[PDB]
Amino acid sequence: VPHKSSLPEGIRPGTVLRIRGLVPPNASRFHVNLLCGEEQGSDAALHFNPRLDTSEVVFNSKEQGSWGREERGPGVPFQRGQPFEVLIIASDDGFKAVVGDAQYHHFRHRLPLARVRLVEVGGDVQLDSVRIF
Amino acid sequence: SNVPHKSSLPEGIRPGTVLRIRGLVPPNASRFHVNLLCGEEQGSDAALHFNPRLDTSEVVFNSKEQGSWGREERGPGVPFQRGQPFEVLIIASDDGFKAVVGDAQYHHFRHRLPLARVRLVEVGGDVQLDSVRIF
Ligand SMILES: OC[C@H]1O[C@@H](S[C@@H]2O[C@H](CO)[C@H](O)[C@H](n3cc(-c4cccc(F)c4)nn3)[C@H]2O)[C@H](O)[C@@H](O)[C@H]1O
């Protein structure tokens, strides 16, 4: 079952999501979604999707049940059996995705920041904690 | 053998910027500081002066503008100890700086100077820095 956390103050520039976890001995992939509602198929302002089995990291958004243009990151800053700490940082012009001690990708806003209400973490990952700062 | 830090921020900092500071407060420590400065000159204006004072058990927040300090704000107690490592997040938002210490929200410092003026991060005083990263 995917982990879900509400954003009680919504998200604004300055909102920081810290996700600590572990990638299982062989995970295929896992994802972090920033969702605009609790209903099934709700829009995703951000879909962050490390894929171990294809060695990619896909970024996308979704509206009206339709994915958008995929953006991909440089390499795979995740490995099976190793713990991670991801920061998702909301700025005025996009989301900064930080893995470890390095800026990994910058994803420009497609949907209004204000519509975001939910963080979802699913797929093959062992979730240690989701913290919102 | 204190280990300080100076980093330039040529493009400045925008709402949604994270300064992560990790280090050790050494056994004899009196105090240390994290400054967000507007220039490289001596006594530059400061959007943020963050000042854990181990010797007085206070954490002071202030700004400096046109050469004059503002009114100090104080956080709730001192989440630092001599002989112990720490992690501080200084998070810039639309309305101010959020200080996070040891994974807990600690203080919120409303902007006094425009964020666009910040040009430099300096960390010094009685601290042995592990790392300073800006995201
Ligand atoms: O956009 C995010 C979503 O991606 C899909 S998977 C997706 O399916 C697409 C079908 O048109 C393409 O096959 C796409 N694609 C494109 C490429 C591609 C194309 C050109 C160059 C190069 F390097 C790669 N490879 N795969 C693939 O990623 C997931 O099911 C969903 O959960 C979510 O992550």
CB A39 within 8 A of CB A114: no
What's the residue count for chain A?
Answer: 133
What is the residue with the minimal CA distance to atom 12 of ligand 1?
Answer: A70
Write the DSSP symbol of residue B76.
S
Look-up of token digits 């210490």 = B101
Give me ligand 1 centre to Cα A60, in Å. 10
Instruction: Report CB contact under 8 Å: A15, B16.
Output: yes
Closest alpha carbon to A110 in A46, A34, A57: A46
Give me ligand 1 centre to Cα A70, in Å. 7
User: Of B93, B133, B135, which has the smallest distance from its Cβ to A96's Cβ?
Assistant: B135
What is the residue with the minimal CA distance to atom 19 of ligand 1?
Answer: A70
Residues 6+ apart with CB under 8 A from B47: B36, B37, B38, B63, B111, B112, B113, B114, B115, B117, B118
Instruction: Report CB contact under 8 Å: A14, B133.
Output: no
Q: Is A38 left (phi over 0), alpha (psi -120 to 50) or beta?
A: alpha
Q: Which chain A positions have a beta carbon within 8 Å of B103's beta carbon?
A: 131
Helices and strands, number each (H, E), in chain B: 0, 12
Domain residue extents for chain B:
1-135
CB A60 within 8 A of CB A47: yes
- List, comma-separated, the residues after which chain A is broken, a break being a C to N distance over 2.5 A; otherwise answer none: none
Whether domain B1-135 has CATH 2.60.120.200: yes
**DSSP, residue by residue, B18-33:** EEEEEEEE-TT--BEE
Give me ligand 1 centre to Cα A71, in Å. 10
In chain A, what's the furthest Cα-to-Cα distance?
37
CB A131 within 8 A of CB A17: yes
Instruction: Report CB contact under 8 Å: A13, B93.
Output: yes
Whether domain A1-133 has CATH 2.60.120.200: yes
* HSE toward the beta carbon, residue B7, CA cutoff 13 A: 17
Residues 6+ apart with CB under 8 A from A123: A2, A27, A28, A29, A30, A31, A49
